[PDB]
Nucleic acid binder design. Structure first.
Ligand code: MN
Ligand code: MN
Length: 178
DNA sequence: GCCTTGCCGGGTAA
DNA sequence: GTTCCGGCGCG
DNA sequence: CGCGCCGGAACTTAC
DNA sequence: CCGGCAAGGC
Protein backbone atom coordinates (compact mmCIF):
# COMPACT_ATOMS: atom_id res chain seq x y z
CA UNK A 1 0.00 0.00 0.00
CA UNK A 2 3.06 2.21 0.32
CA UNK A 3 4.60 0.17 -2.48
CA UNK A 4 1.64 1.00 -4.76
CA UNK A 5 1.74 4.75 -4.24
CA UNK A 6 5.50 4.56 -4.80
CA UNK A 7 4.91 2.71 -8.07
CA UNK A 8 2.52 5.42 -9.19
CA UNK A 9 4.89 8.32 -8.27
CA UNK A 10 7.77 6.54 -9.96
CA UNK A 11 5.74 6.60 -13.20
CA UNK A 12 5.20 10.32 -12.88
CA UNK A 13 8.87 10.79 -11.99
CA UNK A 14 10.14 8.84 -15.00
CA UNK A 15 7.44 10.36 -17.24
CA UNK A 16 7.53 14.08 -16.39
CA UNK A 17 10.41 14.39 -13.92
CA UNK A 18 13.84 13.14 -13.00
CA UNK A 19 16.22 11.64 -10.48
CA UNK A 20 19.21 13.96 -10.12
CA UNK A 21 22.49 13.40 -8.31
CA UNK A 22 24.19 16.81 -8.46
CA UNK A 23 27.78 17.61 -7.47
CA UNK A 24 28.67 21.20 -6.54
CA UNK A 25 31.87 23.05 -5.65
CA UNK A 26 32.67 21.63 -3.29
CA UNK A 27 32.53 19.01 -2.17
CA UNK A 28 28.89 20.02 -1.89
CA UNK A 29 26.17 17.85 -3.36
CA UNK A 30 22.39 17.43 -3.72
CA UNK A 31 19.96 14.61 -4.55
CA UNK A 32 16.60 15.42 -6.12
CA UNK A 33 13.39 13.49 -6.68
CA UNK A 34 11.50 15.66 -9.21
CA UNK A 35 8.05 15.64 -10.82
CA UNK A 36 7.28 18.66 -13.04
CA UNK A 37 3.72 19.46 -14.21
CA UNK A 38 1.70 22.27 -15.82
CA UNK A 39 -1.28 22.43 -13.44
CA UNK A 40 -0.05 24.14 -10.25
CA UNK A 41 -3.33 22.80 -8.96
CA UNK A 42 -2.75 19.13 -9.72
CA UNK A 43 0.68 19.25 -8.08
CA UNK A 44 -0.48 20.99 -4.94
CA UNK A 45 -3.68 19.01 -4.64
CA UNK A 46 -3.10 15.46 -5.87
CA UNK A 47 0.58 14.68 -6.47
CA UNK A 48 2.09 16.44 -3.46
CA UNK A 49 -0.07 14.79 -0.75
CA UNK A 50 0.79 11.39 -2.22
CA UNK A 51 4.50 12.21 -2.09
CA UNK A 52 4.09 13.83 1.33
CA UNK A 53 2.56 10.65 2.71
CA UNK A 54 5.49 8.67 1.35
CA UNK A 55 7.94 11.15 2.88
CA UNK A 56 6.29 10.73 6.29
CA UNK A 57 6.22 6.96 5.99
CA UNK A 58 9.88 6.69 4.95
CA UNK A 59 10.59 9.12 7.79
CA UNK A 60 12.28 11.43 5.34
CA UNK A 61 12.95 14.90 6.72
CA UNK A 62 13.27 16.98 3.56
CA UNK A 63 10.37 19.24 2.67
CA UNK A 64 8.43 19.29 -0.58
CA UNK A 65 9.63 22.23 -2.65
CA UNK A 66 7.31 23.63 -5.29
CA UNK A 67 9.11 25.98 -7.65
CA UNK A 68 7.32 28.07 -10.28
CA UNK A 69 8.86 28.01 -13.73
CA UNK A 70 8.06 29.83 -16.95
CA UNK A 71 6.35 26.84 -18.53
CA UNK A 72 5.61 24.43 -15.70
CA UNK A 73 5.55 23.92 -11.96
CA UNK A 74 8.11 21.63 -10.28
CA UNK A 75 7.60 19.44 -7.26
CA UNK A 76 11.03 18.75 -5.81
CA UNK A 77 12.16 16.79 -2.79
CA UNK A 78 15.85 17.29 -2.02
CA UNK A 79 16.80 14.10 -0.16
CA UNK A 80 19.59 11.56 -0.52
CA UNK A 81 17.40 8.94 1.14
CA UNK A 82 14.49 9.45 -1.25
CA UNK A 83 16.64 9.70 -4.36
CA UNK A 84 18.12 6.25 -3.70
CA UNK A 85 14.68 4.90 -2.70
CA UNK A 86 13.44 5.65 -6.23
CA UNK A 87 16.62 5.01 -8.18
CA UNK A 88 16.84 1.61 -6.49
CA UNK A 89 13.20 0.84 -7.14
CA UNK A 90 13.82 1.62 -10.79
CA UNK A 91 16.51 -1.04 -11.17
CA UNK A 92 14.19 -3.58 -9.62
CA UNK A 93 11.23 -2.66 -11.83
CA UNK A 94 11.05 -5.99 -13.67
CA UNK A 95 10.04 -7.64 -10.41
CA UNK A 96 7.06 -5.39 -9.69
CA UNK A 97 4.08 -7.30 -8.38
CA UNK A 98 0.73 -6.78 -10.09
CA UNK A 99 -0.40 -3.92 -7.84
CA UNK A 100 2.79 -2.05 -8.68
CA UNK A 101 2.60 -2.85 -12.40
CA UNK A 102 -0.82 -1.24 -12.55
CA UNK A 103 0.23 1.77 -10.45
CA UNK A 104 3.39 2.39 -12.41
CA UNK A 105 1.58 2.23 -15.73
CA UNK A 106 -1.15 4.59 -14.51
CA UNK A 107 1.46 7.09 -13.42
CA UNK A 108 3.34 6.78 -16.67
CA UNK A 109 0.08 7.27 -18.65
CA UNK A 110 -0.92 10.31 -16.61
CA UNK A 111 2.51 11.81 -17.26
CA UNK A 112 2.80 11.12 -20.96
CA UNK A 113 0.03 9.01 -22.51
CA UNK A 114 -2.68 10.13 -24.93
CA UNK A 115 -4.92 11.92 -22.46
CA UNK A 116 -7.66 12.67 -25.02
CA UNK A 117 -8.42 8.94 -24.94
CA UNK A 118 -9.49 9.00 -28.58
CA UNK A 119 -6.45 6.78 -28.82
CA UNK A 120 -4.44 4.89 -26.21
CA UNK A 121 -0.73 5.65 -26.52
CA UNK A 122 2.36 6.00 -24.34
CA UNK A 123 5.42 7.86 -25.63
CA UNK A 124 9.05 7.36 -24.60
CA UNK A 125 12.62 7.22 -25.97
CA UNK A 126 13.28 4.20 -23.75
CA UNK A 127 12.29 1.14 -25.84
CA UNK A 128 13.34 -1.24 -23.10
CA UNK A 129 10.98 0.32 -20.60
CA UNK A 130 8.11 0.24 -23.11
CA UNK A 131 9.00 -3.38 -23.79
CA UNK A 132 8.45 -4.10 -20.08
CA UNK A 133 5.17 -2.25 -19.93
CA UNK A 134 4.18 -4.16 -23.07
CA UNK A 135 4.76 -7.54 -21.45
CA UNK A 136 2.81 -6.54 -18.33
CA UNK A 137 -0.08 -5.37 -20.49
CA UNK A 138 -0.10 -8.60 -22.50
CA UNK A 139 -0.39 -10.43 -19.19
CA UNK A 140 -3.30 -8.20 -18.14
CA UNK A 141 -5.18 -9.05 -21.35
CA UNK A 142 -4.47 -5.81 -23.21
CA UNK A 143 -2.95 -6.12 -26.65
CA UNK A 144 -0.46 -3.54 -27.88
CA UNK A 145 2.41 -2.73 -30.26
CA UNK A 146 5.62 -0.76 -30.21
CA UNK A 147 7.13 1.19 -33.07
CA UNK A 148 9.27 4.25 -33.61
CA UNK A 149 6.80 7.15 -33.75
CA UNK A 150 9.09 10.17 -33.89
CA UNK A 151 11.99 9.53 -36.24
CA UNK A 152 13.30 13.00 -35.35
CA UNK A 153 13.91 12.38 -31.63
CA UNK A 154 14.16 8.59 -31.29
CA UNK A 155 10.84 8.51 -29.47
CA UNK A 156 8.95 5.21 -29.40
CA UNK A 157 5.24 4.79 -28.90
CA UNK A 158 3.39 1.97 -27.20
CA UNK A 159 0.00 1.70 -28.86
CA UNK A 160 -2.70 -0.03 -26.84
CA UNK A 161 -5.29 -1.75 -29.05
CA UNK A 162 -8.70 -0.09 -28.96
CA UNK A 163 -9.94 -3.68 -29.18
CA UNK A 164 -9.01 -3.88 -25.51
CA UNK A 165 -9.79 -0.27 -24.47
CA UNK A 166 -12.32 -1.02 -21.74
CA UNK A 167 -10.07 -3.52 -20.04
CA UNK A 168 -7.22 -1.00 -20.14
CA UNK A 169 -9.19 2.05 -18.97
CA UNK A 170 -11.34 0.23 -16.39
CA UNK A 171 -8.56 -1.79 -14.77
CA UNK A 172 -5.71 0.73 -15.09
CA UNK A 173 -6.63 4.39 -15.67
CA UNK A 174 -9.68 4.04 -13.43
CA UNK A 175 -8.17 1.76 -10.80
CA UNK A 176 -8.68 2.54 -7.12
CA UNK A 177 -5.55 0.55 -6.21
CA UNK A 178 -3.83 2.53 -3.43
C1' DG B 1 -19.19 1.53 -43.73
C1' DC B 2 -16.81 1.69 -40.05
C1' DC B 3 -12.77 1.13 -37.16
C1' DT B 4 -8.02 0.71 -36.21
C1' DT B 5 -3.40 2.26 -36.30
C1' DG B 6 1.36 3.54 -38.70
C1' DC B 7 3.25 7.86 -40.18
C1' DC B 8 4.77 12.42 -39.63
C1' DG B 9 5.02 17.74 -38.46
C1' DG B 10 3.91 21.66 -34.65
C1' DG B 11 4.90 23.31 -30.56
C1' DT B 12 3.07 22.74 -25.41
C1' DA B 13 4.33 20.78 -21.48
C1' DA B 14 7.73 19.21 -19.74
C1' DG C 1 13.12 17.72 -18.31
C1' DT C 2 18.54 19.02 -16.76
C1' DT C 3 22.00 21.57 -14.50
C1' DC C 4 23.84 25.70 -13.44
C1' DC C 5 24.09 29.39 -8.98
C1' DG C 6 24.45 31.10 -4.21
C1' DG C 7 23.47 30.18 0.23
C1' DC C 8 22.76 27.34 4.75
C1' DG C 9 22.93 23.20 8.13
C1' DC C 10 25.43 19.77 10.30
C1' DG C 11 28.94 16.71 12.96
C1' DC D 1 36.57 20.26 6.21
C1' DG D 2 33.25 17.50 3.92
C1' DC D 3 28.90 16.55 2.41
C1' DG D 4 23.69 17.18 2.19
C1' DC D 5 19.21 20.50 2.10
C1' DC D 6 17.08 24.92 0.27
C1' DG D 7 15.40 28.35 -3.23
C1' DG D 8 15.70 29.64 -7.53
C1' DA D 9 16.48 29.92 -12.66
C1' DA D 10 18.66 29.48 -17.32
C1' DC D 11 19.02 26.39 -20.69
C1' DT D 12 17.13 22.12 -23.20
C1' DT D 13 13.84 18.82 -25.77
C1' DA D 14 10.88 14.74 -25.44
C1' DC D 15 6.72 14.01 -25.80
C1' DC E 1 1.45 14.94 -26.90
C1' DC E 2 -1.49 16.38 -30.25
C1' DG E 3 -4.17 15.41 -34.24
C1' DG E 4 -4.76 14.89 -39.43
C1' DC E 5 -3.69 11.90 -43.28
C1' DA E 6 -4.47 7.59 -45.60
C1' DA E 7 -3.61 2.39 -45.77
C1' DG E 8 -5.50 -1.73 -44.48
C1' DG E 9 -8.88 -5.29 -42.13
C1' DC E 10 -13.37 -7.20 -41.48
MN1 MN F 1 9.53 11.30 -20.44
MN1 MN G 1 2.38 14.96 -18.57
Amino acid sequence: NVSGISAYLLGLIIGDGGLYKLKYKGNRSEYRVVITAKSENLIKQHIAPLMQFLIDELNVKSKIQIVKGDTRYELRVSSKKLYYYFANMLERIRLFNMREQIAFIKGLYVAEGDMTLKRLRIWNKNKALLEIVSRWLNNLGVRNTIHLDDHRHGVYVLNISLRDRIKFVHTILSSHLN
